[PDB]
Amino acid sequence: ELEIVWKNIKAEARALADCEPMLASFYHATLLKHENLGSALSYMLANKLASPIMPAIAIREVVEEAYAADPEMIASAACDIQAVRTRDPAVDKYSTPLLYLKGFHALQAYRIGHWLWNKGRRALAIFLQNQVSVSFQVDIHPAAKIGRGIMLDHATGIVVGETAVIEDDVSILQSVTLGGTGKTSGDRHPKIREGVMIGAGAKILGNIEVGRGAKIGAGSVVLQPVPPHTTAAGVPARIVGKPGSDKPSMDMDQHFN
Amino acid sequence: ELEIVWKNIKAEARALADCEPMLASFYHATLLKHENLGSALSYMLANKLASPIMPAIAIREVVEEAYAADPEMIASAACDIQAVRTRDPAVDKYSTPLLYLKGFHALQAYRIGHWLWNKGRRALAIFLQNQVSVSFQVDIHPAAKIGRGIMLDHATGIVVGETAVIEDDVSILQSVTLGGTGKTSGDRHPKIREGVMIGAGAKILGNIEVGRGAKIGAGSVVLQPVPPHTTAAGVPARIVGKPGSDKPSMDMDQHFNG
Amino acid sequence: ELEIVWKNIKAEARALADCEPMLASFYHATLLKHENLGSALSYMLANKLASPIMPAIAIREVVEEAYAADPEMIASAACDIQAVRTRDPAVDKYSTPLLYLKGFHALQAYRIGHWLWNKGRRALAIFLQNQVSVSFQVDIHPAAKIGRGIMLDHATGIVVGETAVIEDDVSILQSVTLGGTGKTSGDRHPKIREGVMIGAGAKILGNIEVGRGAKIGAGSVVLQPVPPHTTAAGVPARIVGKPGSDKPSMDMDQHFN
Amino acid sequence: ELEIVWKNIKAEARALADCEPMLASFYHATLLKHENLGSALSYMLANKLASPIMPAIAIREVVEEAYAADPEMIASAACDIQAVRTRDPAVDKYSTPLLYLKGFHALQAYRIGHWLWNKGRRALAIFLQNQVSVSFQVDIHPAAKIGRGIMLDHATGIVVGETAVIEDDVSILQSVTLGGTGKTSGDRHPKIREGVMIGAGAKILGNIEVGRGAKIGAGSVVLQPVPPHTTAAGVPARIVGKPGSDKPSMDMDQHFN
Amino acid sequence: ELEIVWKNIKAEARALADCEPMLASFYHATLLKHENLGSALSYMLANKLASPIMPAIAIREVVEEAYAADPEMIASAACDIQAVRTRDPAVDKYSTPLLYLKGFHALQAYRIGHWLWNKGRRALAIFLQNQVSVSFQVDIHPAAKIGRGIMLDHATGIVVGETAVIEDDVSILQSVTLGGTGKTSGDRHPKIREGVMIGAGAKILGNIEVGRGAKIGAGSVVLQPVPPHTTAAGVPARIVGKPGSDKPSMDMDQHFNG
Amino acid sequence: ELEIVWKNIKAEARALADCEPMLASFYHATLLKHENLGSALSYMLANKLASPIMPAIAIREVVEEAYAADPEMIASAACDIQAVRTRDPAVDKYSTPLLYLKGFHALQAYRIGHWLWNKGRRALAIFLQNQVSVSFQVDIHPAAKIGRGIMLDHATGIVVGETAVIEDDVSILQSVTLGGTGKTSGDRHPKIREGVMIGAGAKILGNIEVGRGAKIGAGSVVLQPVPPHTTAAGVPARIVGKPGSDKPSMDMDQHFN
């Protein structure tokens, strides 16, 4: 439920703003002067994406236009906040993803890019993709189709290509590629279905399925489809076992055979 | 020819300025204002390299001096733009690499650093190497010898050491290391020959040859030479097959055998 | 000794001012104007951790405060400079790590955040952790315990988690993850003992021991303990040989079998 | 009416985007993207009152808050635009004051500070007063009472003190001081009544009356009251004639005897 | 000749870089790097005009285009540098105006705005006028016609309106207004002829002639024409005497009779 | 007494930092984290004089070097704070000059420039003079000799030339020139003796004396010496009267005949 999240964040914003006098005016700015999650998200994205080419105030107008035309982006972000909080044991506050975690920021920046792309504003979407790549080291093509409840933990070196699909409740670590094959357009990127966990450094290549609740071991190179509820690992990857739960995204157990 | 790529780019820029109002001026300053590819390149490298330590306007003189001394660097950039357009299916416009792709920027920044290193301005070349590492997440030592028609797609994590060689028409993906062994000076990094494709996350270490037309599979760790027209894959890498084409850099087929 | 490293840095700085007119004032400000290593480290961290939120002038004051209270951090930095100079054949000068190398800058930033974390100022330590991840592409949790004589060569994509330990005289390359497992707090990150070399791309996951003088091969995924004076390689990693020396961190031999 | 001024501004903005490629995105961001005058005023004040201390994105929120609570400030701005357009023969367009003229920008910044001063937020009002003095070279104390239809032409070196009053339809040129006397609080600054024209460099000092339709000559130093419909000039100023019209602010005739 | 001033400047810059370490790089980038006065001017105007709205690197193209179209603007700047060096006793170096004096910067920024206005790029010229007003506190309308060998000493508060004319070898101090009357278009600002000196705070209003070799005393308010080789002073100004020299702009004698 | 001033400022800094959450981190930075007036002055000058050419951290080192070699500059600034507080009825807090008033800031910037000039660092002093002119619109040549207890109220358009002298306890308003004659070097600027008050827009030209406790009317052009305890006014200036007190700088009575 959306309002829960926002409330917690405000409480946390009070408790914390006393402690660091250095940060006081930063907390008031990012969390305390806003009345909904949407206002805060637009604030942080505006500051995060600001450039000489397009300053913060101009970006915030684009982002607010996107949130007004599609309020479900705000709800997706709330689910993404919850996913990081519940899955990442280094995060126990709802405020942390929104303030600090570049993976969370790159994810919400993609959503604006995606919206822009589906409305025909593709030149702007590509500009934002490549700026997010420079600034947060996450390169997600704005045509990719990404659900909600996604954790991009650490996030540096993530690549998601044009025709990729990432369904709800997926967990992805640093240096993961959902990448293409060939020199031609068309469907050529992975389909990552609900509940999948992808470990650090995994490279998944081509228009292949990674089925519901599968787990991909860290450092794996997946060139063939991976059935649902299965664990794949190695270079190249083979089936080595079965995950310990229904949705490995939720448990983040990195072990494989 | 240089002239075509440049004309194509100008055509694209006119269409782009008319369709996106937030970027009309950006497109005008970076592309429509200029009369040749050399002038557009110096503009984009200047801006993206810019730091408090060294501002855009100072960088631009350095870059222009380099292009006046060695205009083959502009012809090299033009081959690199064409490589990305023909080999990367996410790119349909000649202008995209020049405007947006950090791997293309890093590579043309390398060429400036290389020109400086060879002239004896090593201190400045090392500054820029490390500026490029922070700004574009590509670490290419300026003593490396890198040819043209090179694509660095996505590019985050790419490392290319001091003594590496990369010949013409090579394609390289994100998190590729062309890396060193040992604590000693002298040749210790790979020599990558023409037509080679290197998949994402591959690690190639030491003074070893990767022959013409070879393919290195994603996530591979290559410790021994790879014969021409051969496919290597695994940790550590073994010869597992032969590529489907004479120049796998052109085709970007990522598949390889068990 | 500090005095040695520092004298070498000043001599090199004098020569560099005559080598490159464009950077003479830069070498002056960063090196020639200072009386000791500590003052030049604080100057460098100030300008590199400078944000719109917190400016260079204010961060220097926090770094000076930490160096006064614990001057061993300055001596740790000096050992880190010597480590890069002696181990990295592309670095001959002592000034190079201090001026340019983002792995060296990230490692010293960590020490500031680790000090703040230990004094209970966690909001600021987590703020800096994530700043460093964005600016230098190194993500080190401040609660990690990292010794001295550490080289982080090239450095981009390094991730070190909350409960990791890195003892003295370790060499780590780009895209190395010292990473977690599970969704629970507790010991869950690697323990990297003295003398260990970790090759580019290695992923080491869970609360496991990499013992004295071990070598982890490039691209390897380590899920079980690695005994002392042993080479581990593969995905997943298994024992494949013995290092050619007692401290592979000092020799940087990437070969494995 | 607001609607008129605003429609004129948009029409001019459309033409300017085709006149100058270099500034097309600028005209778009500042004018074409907005739905009313109020939203464009807040955008302009944000980017012009932007500081390292307080960013554009945060100042816009304070300006929007003041315009919601008191929308007559927006209508005052519109009268100020018409005043410059009708009175200044070098300004034909309505967009020009809004885009470029520092006197116009300073005057609208004042209204924000004057509102803040009246709500008791004086630290912020004094902060902005001095920001405007530095950035636009206009020093207006926020407690001054300034009406609407005011032209501050060229504007550099204008000083208006704490207890000054400027009624509607006044024209003031560069280097005009509406200034104090003494070291004590209390009424000590001029009262400038409706229709008055003040020439370049005039110094008007103390709690004195410059009555309806008076003209103050350039370079004059006014120490005693000036009766309505009278011309004052000299150092010190004495009465020298009568203005050629009932509202010299509207005619801008600099001649005196 | 242009060549001398430029050589003199380069000589000065070498000495300056060796003596002040905090500014060695500044001096190198702004002066020692360049091979002619035109290139140094475009560099300094670019940097000082720079705004979030328009960055240095974009300004510099505009400026260079102007100097390529009309290189007399560089010869004009060189006469202005010489005017400041010979007439301002606080300035002994040819480099000081170019580096530091905001009145010299404002004036060369005007020349760019004037070139743009005359070409039909009026919107950009008005942008720059107002950028210069905020950054250097000098408001000079770009339709004004201003010659060369002009000194604007200190310069804060200077206002020059749309229809003003300033001929060669004129010296002007801070808070001088060459100002308008009325709400109507057409000539309404002063025409200042050759050799005129205008003291600090003088206000000169309307379409009136100030003749060759005249002197306008500090703090004066001039409402009627001033004959050649005459001294005007007062509020309002009266003819009070004759200047000590044929060209008071050269001598900068501020004295005038009761 | 110096410590008084500093104390008051800290008390004021607490009382005020509660009120404006926007400014909280700015107050902590400018006033609360410093233990003496010298540290605060160096902070504010560093931020105020920062440029791409010479960032804040580098400037602060120059300024601290100057304050260590000559601590009387810090005391002069304290007397300048007191002068503004006691003479300007719009200022009643000791913090206001230090935080906000560009006249105060330009004065203390001159002192650094003066120190630099007397040590042979003239190229740097001239760079700072011209930056202060651009940034605060006060142009003071660093060779001028300026005492303590000086008020530069409003300050925009002030010019003080190379050979000028300003003794202790002088009050100067906006647009005042202490200016030169001729094209030759040598003594050619005014000598302004103790207690003088100079009104807005006054132009004082040549190597002439303005005697102890004299008053110069606003808008006056002074080309001849002005005896002690005398009032001069007009264009050109003549003796018109005698000031109402011993030191007109203290009372700020702008009236003249």
Side-chain angles (χ1 to χ4, degrees), chain D:
Chain D
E1 183 61 10
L2 278 56
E3 272 83 354
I4 233 75
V5 171
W6 186 245
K7 299 201 209 154
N8 273 82
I9 289 171
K10 294 211 67 179
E12 295 162 352
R14 284 194 288 280
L16 288 165
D18 289 324
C19 283
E20 188 46 60
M22 303 274 295
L23 299 171
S25 307
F26 174 66
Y27 302 128
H28 196 256
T30 55
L31 301 180
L32 298 170
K33 267 217 172 166
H34 310 283
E35 217 59 40
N36 47 55
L37 186 56
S39 156
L41 282 172
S42 83
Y43 186 88
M44 220 72 51
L45 285 173
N47 273 326
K48 294 239 166 278
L49 306 180
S51 50
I53 295 96
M54 262 198 299
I57 193 155
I59 292 146
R60 189 169 198 189
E61 301 226 284
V62 179
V63 174
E64 296 272 62
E65 213 256 272
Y67 288 159
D70 180 22
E72 286 289 310
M73 294 187 284
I74 294 162
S76 291
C79 291
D80 297 336
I81 292 167
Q82 252 174 123
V84 176
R85 185 183 166 281
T86 60
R87 302 167 203 178
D88 186 356
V91 173
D92 30 22
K93 298 190 294 298
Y94 295 83
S95 51
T96 304
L98 186 50
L99 294 177
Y100 304 131
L101 304 181
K102 79 190 189 190
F104 172 82
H105 298 142
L107 181 54
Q108 307 321 318
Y110 149 78
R111 294 188 200 287
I112 300 309
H114 181 65
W115 181 78
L116 290 167
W117 182 269
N118 283 346
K119 302 274 111 73
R121 291 170 71 181
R122 314 210 145 154
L124 195 59
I126 292 287
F127 177 100
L128 295 169
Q129 172 192 3
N130 291 97
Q131 173 100 272
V132 169
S133 179
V134 162
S135 300
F136 311 141
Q137 305 86 43
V138 180
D139 189 340
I140 299 168
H141 194 285
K145 298 186 169 58
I146 305 169
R148 50 170 59 172
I150 311 300
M151 176 172 71
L152 306 182
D153 193 20
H154 303 296
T156 144
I158 288 164
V159 175
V160 183
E162 166 173 32
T163 67
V165 180
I166 307 173
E167 290 189 342
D168 296 344
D169 294 327
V170 176
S171 296
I172 300 171
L173 275 113
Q174 61 274 16
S175 250
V176 166
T177 284
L178 307 184
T181 328
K183 41 129 78 199
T184 318
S185 296
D187 235 48
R188 65 193 186 282
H189 291 96
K191 270 83 190 152
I192 305 299
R193 299 301 173 194
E194 179 163 354
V196 172
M197 199 267 275
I198 313 183
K203 309 285 186 292
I204 306 176
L205 302 177
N207 185 13
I208 65 182
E209 191 75 30
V210 181
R212 276 189 122 69
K215 185 203 286 196
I216 311 297
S220 296
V221 172
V222 186
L223 302 175
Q224 287 167 122
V226 174
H229 310 278
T230 259
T231 302
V235 178
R238 42 74 139 111
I239 310 315
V240 295
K242 279 215 176 222
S245 72
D246 291 33
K247 270 183 169 194
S249 57
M250 311 292 293
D251 285 303
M252 301 306 307
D253 183 7
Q254 300 298 138
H255 290 286
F256 58 85
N257 321 263

Side-chain angles (χ1 to χ4, degrees), chain F residues 8-226:
Chain F
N8 281 72
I9 297 180
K10 283 214 91 166
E12 288 165 8
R14 287 179 288 267
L16 281 263
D18 302 312
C19 298
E20 296 298 333
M22 298 296 282
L23 300 171
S25 284
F26 156 88
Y27 277 70
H28 186 249
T30 53
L31 307 179
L32 299 168
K33 77 201 183 96
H34 315 291
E35 274 149 311
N36 52 69
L37 180 52
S39 283
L41 287 166
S42 71
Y43 194 78
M44 84 81 179
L45 286 165
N47 287 311
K48 259 63 229 299
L49 299 177
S51 48
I53 300 137
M54 198 166 36
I57 199 149
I59 284 150
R60 203 185 190 187
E61 291 190 344
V62 175
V63 174
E64 295 276 23
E65 190 189 335
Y67 289 154
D70 187 22
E72 294 283 13
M73 288 188 282
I74 299 157
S76 296
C79 288
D80 296 339
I81 286 163
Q82 268 274 233
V84 179
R85 172 164 168 282
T86 64
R87 296 172 213 174
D88 189 5
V91 178
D92 50 28
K93 309 214 288 277
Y94 292 88
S95 43
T96 297
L98 176 59
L99 291 159
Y100 303 129
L101 302 189
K102 66 191 196 191
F104 174 81
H105 299 150
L107 191 51
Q108 307 325 313
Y110 146 83
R111 298 198 193 278
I112 307 313
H114 185 63
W115 184 82
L116 285 169
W117 178 278
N118 289 336
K119 278 175 57 53
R121 299 187 76 187
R122 301 190 168 186
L124 187 58
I126 295 283
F127 172 96
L128 295 168
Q129 168 199 4
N130 290 107
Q131 169 132 279
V132 168
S133 178
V134 164
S135 300
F136 308 130
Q137 306 86 51
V138 179
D139 182 344
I140 301 163
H141 193 288
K145 295 160 78 71
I146 303 171
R148 58 174 53 174
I150 313 304
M151 180 176 67
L152 304 186
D153 191 18
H154 305 301
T156 130
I158 285 173
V159 175
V160 177
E162 185 184 352
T163 63
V165 174
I166 306 184
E167 295 193 341
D168 296 344
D169 298 329
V170 172
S171 294
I172 300 175
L173 276 97
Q174 61 275 17
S175 222
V176 170
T177 287
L178 305 184
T181 356
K183 61 133 122 66
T184 314
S185 292
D187 213 346
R188 65 192 180 276
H189 290 93
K191 273 46 186 186
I192 308 298
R193 304 297 170 177
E194 200 177 298
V196 173
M197 195 268 274
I198 310 172
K203 310 294 186 277
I204 311 177
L205 304 174
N207 187 21
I208 54 169
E209 289 292 327
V210 177
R212 210 173 214 70
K215 190 214 288 188
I216 308 295
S220 304
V221 180
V222 183
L223 307 169
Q224 275 137 123
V226 175

